[PDB]
Amino acid sequence: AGSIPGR
Amino acid sequence: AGSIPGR
Amino acid sequence: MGSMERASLIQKAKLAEQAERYEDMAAFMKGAVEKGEELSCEERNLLSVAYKNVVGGQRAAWRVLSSIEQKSNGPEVREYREKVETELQGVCDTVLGLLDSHLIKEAGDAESRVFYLKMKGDYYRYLAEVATGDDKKRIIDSARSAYQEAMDISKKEMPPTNPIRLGLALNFSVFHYEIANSPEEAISLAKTTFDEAMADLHTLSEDSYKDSTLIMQLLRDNLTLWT
Amino acid sequence: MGSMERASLIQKAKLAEQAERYEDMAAFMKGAVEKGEELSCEERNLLSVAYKNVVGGQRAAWRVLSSIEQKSNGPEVREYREKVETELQGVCDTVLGLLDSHLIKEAGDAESRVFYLKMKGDYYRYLAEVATGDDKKRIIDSARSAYQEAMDISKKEMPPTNPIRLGLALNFSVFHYEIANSPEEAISLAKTTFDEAMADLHTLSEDSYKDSTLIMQLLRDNLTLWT
Ligand SMILES: *Cc1ccc(S(=O)(=O)N(C)C2CCCCC2)cc1
Ligand SMILES: *Cc1ccc(S(=O)(=O)N(C)C2CCCCC2)cc1
Ligand SMILES: [Ca+2]
Ligand SMILES: [Ca+2]
Ligand SMILES: [Cl-]
Ligand SMILES: [Cl-]
């Protein structure tokens, strides 16, 4: 499950 | 120009 | 970083990002926050990128060491996992300290306040990933409470396609799935968020459309993994 | 790391490598060296891998910052490039200090002594990459002298396919090309090294053949770029 990346 | 890598 | 100008710390944070020196970048941005002035949108992103990369590397290392420790179950693996875990907790505590002194209390616009509350939820979530003691439940509730306040503001003040609103919903859905053992809540939140954003895309410019659809795809990627 | 057992430092260095925590890995291996005992082949590789990764990241960041500084020609880019450069020099000085106190002087077998002298050449070469002052020529000569002593031993004591002998020749050829402004010497060394190894491959097992041909391909890759 992926959370938000920085860029 | 490439030098040696560690592994 | 008390002797360096605010503008110089911001410039050096941007250079550190270019050089992939994220520990430096976080130290520069901590110094900038400690000048006491509010952060612009760009500066908030610099702060978030710096710490997300620092703690992201710590989490990856903690997971490697925790896996080795579990398979092994001398003291060395546990000792080293504990060392990395303490460093990770220290970085999370530093970020949470900046949010509490005094970024959140001075953030009055929805964009800034939601941004900082989402960060607060994220760093409590990272603490929860390694927590095992008497305060684990309280750490999880702290993450939930921060995400929930951010959600309440975002639903009242931002359109459903707003990228911060979307990213908040994405990360809160991950919290539900991975931390709170609530996969159905995670799926419901991700689905409702995606569907409400879809219905609002017609209002957006080409550039805003690209921003919103990128995060919608992240919601869809999780829904594909979870269903 | 004075209070930690040598064997625990070695074990933790291996864990740090698995976790991609190269700064930790270098600190553990520095502690192991400072116990005062000689290093086995595996332990020498751990020491070399740790510092090569630490200084490799510093060099990459220095190159990014130096490029930005050159294009710009406030003080911030120069100041930050100088900060990174000083950290890089400090790591090189640390490695060189370990080699001088007392790894080289206790290394009597060809494999260990060549290994450490190649390291000494490499870390002076990294110092030379950033040097601009009154000692630049002396830094370059220090690299050359270390590589040359290693070369003299390797040609007398090791077969032409030995991986340390091959890697030494590769890195000395890079020194000639990139540092000493001697591209013809670089090409000649790489070609002669490759050809003499080729003629010795028939003596090797399948596993040794794989080791030697891997480094030969690195020599060939440079020759393709240089000719
Ligand atoms: C939590 C969060 C969500 C979105 C943003 S952003 O400013 O829109 N931005 C940096 C996006 C982040 C994900 C990948 C594309 C851009 C910031 C913070
Ligand atoms: C300088 C040098 C050369 C070769 C070695 S090694 O022990 O043979 N080894 C780690 C190789 C390094 C290059 C990639 C494959 C293996 C060590 C040090
Ligand atoms: Ca000022
Ligand atoms: Ca002992
Ligand atoms: Cl305000
Ligand atoms: Cl000896």
CA dihedral angle for residue D218, residue D202, residue D151, residue D29, rounded to 10 degrees: 70
Domain ranges of chain C: 6-227
**Selection from D71, D68, D92, D89 nearest residue D80 by Cα:** D68
User: Angle formed by the axes of helices C22-34 and C6-18, to 10°?
Assistant: 160
Q: Are C103 and C115 in contact (CB under 8 A)?
A: no
Cα–Cα distance for residue pair D7/C213, rounded to 1 Å: 52
* Residue from D55, D83, D90, D51 nearest D69 by CA: D83
Q: Give the nearest ligand 2 atom to D41 CA.
A: 7
- Helix D6-18 to helix C41-72 angle (10° resolution) is 120
Give the closest of C8, C20, C68 to D15, CB-based. C68
The CATH classification of domain C6-227, taken from the options 3.40.50.1010, 3.40.109.10, 3.40.50.2000, 1.20.190.20:
1.20.190.20
Here the tokens at position C78 are 């546990």
Neighbours of D92 (CB within 10 A): 24
* Atom 17 of ligand 1, nearest CA residue: C164
Would you say the C-alpha torsion D72, D76, D79, D80 has a positive or negative sign?
A: negative
Evaluate whether C46 touches C110 at the Cβ level (below 8 Å).
no
Which of C5, A5, D179, C63 minimizes the C-alpha distance to B1?
D179
C163 to C49, C113, C212, C214: CA distances (angstroms): 15, 14, 6, 9
Please report, to the nearest 10 degrees, the dihedral formed by the alpha carbons of residues D141, D147, D148, D149 taken in order: 110
Q: For chain A, say whether C177 makes contact (Cβ under 8 Å).
A: yes
Please, which residues have CB within 8 angstroms of residue C92's CB and are 6 or more apart in sequence? Answer: C55, C123, C124, C126, C127
Partner A contacted by C171 (CB < 8 A): yes
Residues 183-202 of C with CB under 8 A from D: none
Long-range contact pairs involving C106-111 (C-beta distance under 8 Å, separation at least 24): C106/C38, C107/C38, C110/C153, C110/C154, C110/C156, C110/C157, C110/C158, C111/C41, C111/C158, C111/C164
Angle at D181 between CA D175 and CA D183, to 5 degrees: 80
Distance set, CA D49 to CA D17, D22, D26, D66, D144 (Å): 9, 8, 8, 25, 22
Residue D165 C-beta-side C-alpha neighbours within 13 Å = 19
With b for 16 or more beta-carbon neighbours within 10 A and e for fewer, the D184-202 pattern comes to eebbebbbebbebbeeeee
Contact D223, D195 (CB under 8 A): no
Q: How many CB atoms lie within 10 A of CB C94?
A: 17
- Kindly report the nearest CA distance between residue C23 and chain A, in angstroms: 15
DSSP conformational letter for C21: -
Cβ contact C118:C166 at 8 Å: no
**Residue D7 C-alpha, separation from nearest chain C C-alpha, in angstroms:** 10
Helix, strand or coil, per DSSP, at residue D19: coil
Under 8 Å between Cβ of D158 and D141: no
Contact B3, D171 (CB under 8 A): yes
Technique that determined the structure: X-ray
CA distance D23 to D30: 11
CA distances from C169 to C143, C150, D6 (A): 13, 9, 49
Residue whose CA is at the smallest distance from ligand 2 atom 17? D164
Spell out which residues of chain D touch residue C54, defining contact as CB-CB under 8 Å: none
Opening angle at CA C185, ends C181 and C191, nearest 5: 135
Which of D108, D127, D174, D107 is CA-nearest to residue D147? D174
Instruction: Give the closest of C52, C178, C218 to A6, CB-based.
Output: C52
Residue C39, token pair as written in the block: 């952060």
